[PDB]
Design a protein that fits this description.
This is part of a larger assembly, with chains A and B. Chain A is built from 22 helices and ten strands. Chain A has helices at 4-13, 32-48, 60-69, 88-92, 116-119, 138-141, 152-172, 184-195, 200-210, 224-233, 267-272, 275-280, 286-299, 303-307, 315-319, 324-332, 354-366, 371-390, 400-422, 450-464, 508-516, 537-548, and strands spanning 24-27, 53-56, 76-80, 104-108, 251-254, 341-347, 350-353, 477-479, 488-490, 532-533. In chain A, helix 2 runs parallel beside helix 8 (184-195), helix 8 runs antiparallel to helix 9 (200-210) and helix 17 packs across helix 19. Classes of the chains: A alpha/beta, B alpha+beta. Chain A binds chain B through residues 246, 266, 307-309, 311-312, 314-315, 318, 347-350, 395, and chain B through 17-21, 45-47, 49-51, 53-54, 56-57, 60, 99-101. Chain A: GO terms for molecular function: chromatin binding; DNA replication origin binding; single-stranded DNA binding.
């Protein structure tokens, strides 16, 4: 509810001291956006050389272990991606200490709607709600100034009728789907441009941030291109090349493709594993696989030349890469492939597509790495976080490729198993919504991570619906290996075929909390996201039955 | 042959200006190779194709007409590094190993002939060494023409012109520079 620059000067005044400082910025959690945000944030701190702690939090339940344990001198705290949904004032408590409260916890979140207790009643925040939903948002505005603090019998009856009158519309709010408005990174950059830093790798961090989520919607991002492209116009390494030159040597616009790993993998394998194209061409089917080859017969690209790594393909095919696709792809309905994208060239190393980089980092997060076992695993993910954090750095590229050799493999897993599902037609159309469960599969170790099931769930909800009449219906998935029937189940959102009228607001967040409040059968919201929960095989089936009814949508 | 000048200038500009941040990998590959008396260079194609797409476009086109202009191109560089003046320095062999796409043995049938092919197999037996030639002098049986023939790679008959004929040219083995050869055979 504040100016970004002024919130900045506040976090400046409470910061620098002897001993320095102290602030812990919480990077959270598994979302690439977090990295994108906190890296340019951390670089900004290093600019004024302000000491910082930075914590890799996984579990939402895990945050309590930290904040309740170690705090001493820390008067100014910062947090990322948490608290937009569940309020930490009740969750942490707080317990006001010393107006002009000593500690300011900044909470940065893209999630909506905000918790009601957060924005109004200033204690721990210093909210980041600005500027996306301001709004009004008159529904939260009347939620308090009316409620607080609230012949005489008719005035009591009138008063109470008014109270429930506000409580109904208030109940409409805060019970709702969790949907990201704008990427937190973008706003950190809006905060950053007011201070005056135009830095190139910074901007690349923004591009990374925005393009973190294009796998899932945009939704506003379709109109974020002005806010990026203009900035790309606010700077330039040289008016003209001047090949290369070995330095600056920076990012530029190119006809990029939702196509998967075009530059770091072989072309044919790049269609065959791509996510958008899995769908339209029915590639899980042997009968459709051929249709790809017909694409190549249309392009005049040899099959043998399609099998070869993209660095080494002939030059003629490169110069025709932006034409041939226009000549052909239009006929297959694949006409939405070509985006205007961002590509940063490091020169003699190669170039990297904005999206593919994100595929590298995601790749890093799950691989390349009774409560003791889950804690130890979540711990392994915590360590792995930094292995992924390092790849963002420019000076070490040598491990970034270790991401990509993984990002390929994962797909080779994911695709494979994905097909293993469609052969058995495991989809349960049900009535109100679509649902699935993986009872068996190869290498569930890869599927342990929330984000792995976010991407498999994504290629699957993308595959089932082209569309593909009728009625985009949200999907459900489940997997188990070890940790005694943890059976991780993540919520999902429907995918429109590039024509998106409504955000549609994932409802699993609410539907799960209704069940936690009913019989709560081995239901665990331990994962940071409201869409993803844990379950046991003993209680999963009654849970599934209680999921089927009553349907909130 | 101004074109060969144009190609070799690009190869020199590829060796002297190449930067992996910030050491020059090749240029030092060179020095550290002449000192141990290795007289070789190993190019990494990915860096090559990174540098110019063009020279790799031609190098995968007609390799055997180009690669030796790359050899002479690099040895003309070691002249400016390993020594200085104002010998003898053999033209270095380049060894280029790169990822690309593995092409299995069964799948080699014509069509890629004279195009660089990465592959994989278990070597059966190695043939005993024998020398080919690199630089050999030649005198005529009659007019006694003294000809220094620079034989290159990659067979090549001797020139018949300074009766005389048909092929009056003798190999002088007292001045002739020789290299070695192996013949692997791989299953």
């Amino acid at each position: 509810i504040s100016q970004f620059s002024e919130a900045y000067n506040k976090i400046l005044r409470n910061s620098s001291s002897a001993s320095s400082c102290q602030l812990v910025i919480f990077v959270s959690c598994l979302n690439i956006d977090a990295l994108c945000a906190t890296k340019m944030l951390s670089l900004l701190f290093k600019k004024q050389l302000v000491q910082s702690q930075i914590v890799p939090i996984f579990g939402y339940s895990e945050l309590r272990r930290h904040y309740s344990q170690l705090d001493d001198n820390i008067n100014s705290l910062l947090l990322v991606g948490f608290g937009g949904v569940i309020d930490l004032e009740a969750f942490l408590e707080i317990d006001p200490q010393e107006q002009s409260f000593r500690r300011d916890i900044y909470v940065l979140d893209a999630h909506r709607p905000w918790n009601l207790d957060n924005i109004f009643g200033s204690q721990i925040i210093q909210c980041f709600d600005d500027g996306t939903v301001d709004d009004t948002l008159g529904e939260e505005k009347e939620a308090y100034y009316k409620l607080l603090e609230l012949n005489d019998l008719s005035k009591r009856k009138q008063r109470k009728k008014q109270i429930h009158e506000y409580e109904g519309v208030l109940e409409e709010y805060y019970s709702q789907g969790t949907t990201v408005v704008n990427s937190i990174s973008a706003q950190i950059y809006s905060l950053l441009s007011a201070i005056g830093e135009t830095n190139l790798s910074n901007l690349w961090l923004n591009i990374l941030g925005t393009t973190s989520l294009d796998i899932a919607y945009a939704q506003v991002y379709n109109r974020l291109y002005p806010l990026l492209q203009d900035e790309v116009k606010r700077l330039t390494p040289s008016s003209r090349n001047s090949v290369k030159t070995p330095d600056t040597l920076t990012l530029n616009i190119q006809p990029d493709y939702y196509l998967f790993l075009l530059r770091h993998s072989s072309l044919y394998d790049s269609f065959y594993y791509s996510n958008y194209v899995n769908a339209k061409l029915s590639l899980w089917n042997e009968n459709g696989k051929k249709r790809l080859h017909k694409m190549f017969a249309r392009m005049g690209i040899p099959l043998s030349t399609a099998q070869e790594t993209w660095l080494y393909m002939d030059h003629s095919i490169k110069r025709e890469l932006g034409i041939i696709f226009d000549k052909n792809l239009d006929r297959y309905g694949l006409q939405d492939i070509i985006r205007d994208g961002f590509v940063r060239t490091l020169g003699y190393r190669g170039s990297i597509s904005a999206s593919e980089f994100v595929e590298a980092l995601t790749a890093l997060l799950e691989v390349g790495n009774s409560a003791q076992k889950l804690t130890n695993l979540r711990k392994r993910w915590v360590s792995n976080f930094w292995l992924s954090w390092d790849a963002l750095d420019d000076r070490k590229v040598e491990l970034l490729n270790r991401g990509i050799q993984l990002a390929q493999d994962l797909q080779r897993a994911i695709f494979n198993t994905g097909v293993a599902i469609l052969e058995k037609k495991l989809i349960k159309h049900l009535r109100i919504y679509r649902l699935c469960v993986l009872q068996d599969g190869p290498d569930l170790d890869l599927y342990r991570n929330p984000l792995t099931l976010l991407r498999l769930g994504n290629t699957l909800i993308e595959c089932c619906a082209e569309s593909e009449d009728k009625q985009l219906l949200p999907m459900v998935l489940a997997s188990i290996d070890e940790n005694t029937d943890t059976y991780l189940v993540a919520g999902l959102t429907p995918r429109y075929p590039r024509g998106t009228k409504k955000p549609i607001l994932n409802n699993f967040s609410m539907a799960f909390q209704q069940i936690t409040a009913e019989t709560d059968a081995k239901v665990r919201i331990d994962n940071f996201e409201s869409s993803i929960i844990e379950i046991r095989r003993e209680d999963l089936s009654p849970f599934l039955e209680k999921l089927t009814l009553s349907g909130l949508l | 042959d101004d074109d060969n000048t144009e190609i070799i200038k690009s190869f020199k500009n590829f060796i002297l200006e190449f930067r992996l941040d910030s050491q020059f990998i090749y240029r030092d590959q060179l020095r550290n190779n002449i000192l141990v008396k290795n007289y070789s260079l190993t190019v990494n194609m990915e860096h090559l194709i990174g540098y110019n797409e063009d020279i790799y476009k031609k190098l995968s086109d007609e390799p055997s007409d180009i690669i030796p202009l790359f050899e002479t191109a690099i040895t003309q560089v070691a002249k400016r590094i390993s020594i200085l003046s104002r010998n003898s320095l053999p033209t270095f062999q380049l060894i280029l190993n790169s990822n690309a796409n593995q092409i299995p043995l069964r799948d080699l049938d014509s069509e890629h002939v004279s195009k660089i092919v990465r592959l994989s197999g278990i070597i059966i037996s190695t043939s005993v060494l024998s020398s080919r030639a690199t630089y050999l002098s030649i005198m005529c049986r009659n007019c006694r023409h003294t000809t220094s023939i620079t034989i290159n790679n990659f067979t090549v008959s001797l020139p018949r012109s300074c009766n005389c004929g048909p092929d009056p040219y003798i190999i002088i083995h007292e001045s002739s520079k020789f290299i070695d050869q192996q013949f692997l055979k791989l299953q």
